[model samples]
Every structure is written in C-alpha cells, then in structure tokens.
Target: ACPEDWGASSLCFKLYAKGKHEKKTWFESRDFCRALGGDLASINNKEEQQTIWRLITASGSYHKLFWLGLTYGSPSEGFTWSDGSPVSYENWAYGEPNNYQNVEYCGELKGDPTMSWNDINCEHLNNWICQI
Candidate 1:
C-alpha cells in the first residue's frame, strides 16, 4: 500500500507532495525521495506525463511549479534523467530552458494549465513529485 501522505494513480506510481509549503531545492528534493525509497519522477511519455499532470491539477496546485528528474548536465552532455534514462521525450515550454544566466540547469514543471517543462536554478525551492 502507498504511504500515508502519498497517492498512487497506479500500482507502481506512488506520488506525493506535502502541500504548497513543502518546497525544497532540487538536491534536497531528490534526497527526500531517496529517503522514501524512491526518487524524482521521470516522465518518459505523453501518457505518463499526463498522469503526473493530473495529480497536480487534482491537488489544486495549478499555480505552483513541480520539480522533475531532468537536468541539463552540460553543453556537450545535454540533458539527462536522474534515473539514468536517455532523453527520448520532452515537453519544454516555448523558448524554454534558455538556461537563463547559464544557471538554470534543473528542470521544473510549470503550472496554471500548461504543465510544460522549464529550466530553473537547482537551488530554487519548489514543490516536487516523488515516485515510489
């Protein structure tokens, strides 16, 4: 069964977010997921992406951003998922990821309908999705 604060849209997809105030940086967010015997979610396809989006919309967090496992490793290396999966799918917002200031290495899901992806600083605190 899923843990107290976590909800599962399917048997293996357990998701959790401690409301709006429970925000943490990318590193800390990853650490939290690891501690819970899981890690940040890796959205690999449209179906999976929509599943994660539905969870956010249902939570009434339409105005907040949620961290994902994607990261811009470097110019040459490009992007990678925390789970070691190769980049096969993407949902970046228009002109997104600009890697603004050259420090927006971490990927986040923008809310308020789009639910598209965006690059942001890893240290910026935001809500995150944990998959267990």
Candidate 2:
C-alpha cells in the first residue's frame, strides 16, 4: 500500500479492503483507498511485487481480490507509480493489460503467489491492499 499522505507523511503507507467476499467496483475501490490516504499499491520491481504477494497471502481472505495502480488511460493520461514516479518498468502478465474494454483502467492482484495482474474497471469492488 502506498501512503495515503505520501505527499506529506513520507513514511508508513497503508493498505485497505472493502467488502468481505462480494466485489465492489474499481472506482469504488479507488475511492476507498483514496479515502484512506492511498490510491492503490503499485509494483515497481520484483521485490516489491513479492512483498505485495506476501501481504495478500498472509491475509486470511486468500481468495479475495483487490486493485493496484496500473492503467492505460491514454497517452495524455500518463502512467504513474503509486509513489508518484513515472513508470519505468512493467511486468504485466501474458496478454494482459489489454485495457480490453477501453474502459478498463485499474489494476488488481489475484491471490496467487505468482502475483498475476488483471485489468478491471475502477468501480469493481474487491479486497485491496496498500502500502507507503
């Protein structure tokens, strides 16, 4: 989880989840994370990716899903890491990030230790994790 006040706190990022089993929408999840002072956890490297996997796996709700910070809004929309850095690297799953619906702009992590990513509408609700 990226810090909610990352712009201020500069330390201690937080993670959040809404709904226990049911899925909310992506936008809803984004709003939830934002309300908590975070947006969504963004992956920067393999180590960070592993850390995120560990956090999700440690949670009792191993089957639950949640959102991250990768999207394909538009060239003008630009991609940014949760830490607010320009995305320099990517590890998208095979054929992933198609942004298929042209509306799918949010990212989510499945429970698998593999840390695979899925494209989703920001309104879909699912358990989410955050950090700072």
Candidate 3:
C-alpha cells in the first residue's frame, strides 16, 4: 500500500506493475485499472494535463513510457477514456499515437520536463499511473 499520509492527489494516483509477472499487455493493464474503481489518468483539459505532466516529469520515474486510460477499443475509433467518455483535450507528444508500428494501442505520459508523450509497446515493463 502507499504511505498513509499521502495527499489526495497522490492517493488518487498509483504505479502498477507491468503485468502478472511484472509484464502485462495493454489490454491487461486496462483491466487492472478498471478493477481499481478508476481508469488510467485521462487529461480532460490543458491545465489538468499540464499538472499531471509536471508531476510525472518531476518524478523521474517516467524515464520509460507508461500507460494511460486512453485507448481505441473495437467499435470505438479515435480516443476514449476508460470510463467510456470522449476525450476533451489531447497533448500528444510530437508524432505520437502513431500506434508504434501499428502494434501500440496504449498511451503513456512521457516524463520529460518538456511535457511530451510517446507511444510504446504495452507489453514492455514500465510503471503505470492510475487516478480515482
């Protein structure tokens, strides 16, 4: 469990293992986030997006890409939040969401102070972010 004294913002966030053996696919991560009563962190506006971006960039743990709640499941095109809401805003890192050679169907916030994003193979071992 996380520290008891953590603030709500921190409490609303958590880092998850990549998968069952510390290696999960994008779909697996999505299921895990849903089980937590929250979806992956989805940025609705620039302000919230910037805040999360800053937090991740400062943490330095995002050196590797991670997973977000944005995905295009079957029958759904474009982007949709795990909670089944349309995306209100986007801050895709330059040339991102390209689907990473058409294999990446997940998103992760890049931990660069520049506040950029990158598309990566969901099966790769990387920390994940969850919000309540």
Candidate 4:
C-alpha cells in the first residue's frame, strides 16, 4: 500500500518537482530519493512508463530528461534496478542502449512526445523520478 504521503494512479509513485534546469548524476539522484524516504522510480511496464510520461509532460518538462532506476550493473550482473528489485520490463528508444562510447550505462527518460528511454553516462546530470 502507498503511504499516506503518497498518491496512487496506474501505480503508486511520487512525482517530485522539477528543478530549475537542474540535473544530478545517477548516484546523486539515487541518494536524493533515499533521503526523501524513497528510491529512484522503477518502471514495471509500458503502462507504468506512459503514466510517468504523462506526469512529466504535465509538469512542463516535456523537453528535458529524468533519471530512472535502470542502468548497467556489470558484465556478470547485466543491467539492474537501482532500487534492488528485479527489472520487470524495459523501454529503450530506437538504437538506444548502444552503450554509446561504452560508458552510457545509466538510463534516462527523454521527456519528448515519445517519452522514450536512452542510455546515459551515470556521471551526467538530469532530473529524476522517485517512488515511496
């Protein structure tokens, strides 16, 4: 069940306000969510992705990016969720996860009309989502 402080829709996740053209590295984004009593939001399926997309677009971030819980874990471990849960689904954009330059392991949602995902460098900054 979602806590009293959380609201529910297609799934129960908290949508944090966007910063002033702000972004954070994947590690910083993950820590930010934890500090807020949650973790980076993990997408379970297309429906979840769509719901999240709508939320971001509605928030006037249709052209920005947001950090997600998805990222490359390791060669042996493969990709994994930052929240420590099994990944139930994925939504990489076309030609994405190219692991461009072999360092774009982190994941992000490009908040365009497509609301698609792309692999990014973890050290780069981007807004983020959280789940409580």
Q: What is the TM-score of each candidate against the true structure?
A: 0.84, 0.69, 0.70, 0.84
Better of 1 and 4 by lDDT: 4
Q: What is the number of backbone collisions in each predicted candidate, taken in the order shown?
A: 0, 17, 1, 1
The alpha-carbon deviation from the true structure for residue 95 of candidate 1, after best TM-score superposition, in angstroms, is 0.7
CA displacement after TM-score superposition, residue 77 of candidate 1 (Å): 2.2
Distance (Å) between predicted and true CA of 15, model 3? 3.8
Scored against the true structure, residue 49 in model 3 reaches a CA lDDT of 58
Off by over 4 Å in 4: 1-7
Q: Using alpha carbons, what is the TM-score of model 2?
A: 0.69
| Residue lDDT tens for model 3, 1-132 | 444421133334555534445745566767777786766777676666565665665555556566777776674566677777886677788787788677776676665565565666666665666666
Task: Report every candidate's CA lDDT.
Answer: 0.77, 0.61, 0.63, 0.77
- Residues 1-132, model 1: lDDT tens digits: 666555554423434456556789999988987897888877777777776767777777676788888877657777788776677888899998788988899898886566689989999988888777
lDDT ranking of the models:
4, 1, 3, 2
lDDT tens per residue, model 4, 1-132: 667555455456666555666668889889999998778988888777776777775667667788888878767666688866776687779998788888888888787778678988899878888876
lDDT of 2 by residue, 54-126 (tens): 6555555475566776655456755555445566657667887777757777777776766777776766666
Which parts of model 2 have CA positions greater than 4 angstroms off?
Answer: 1-23, 76-79, 82-84
Cα displacement (Å) at residue 98, model 1? 0.7
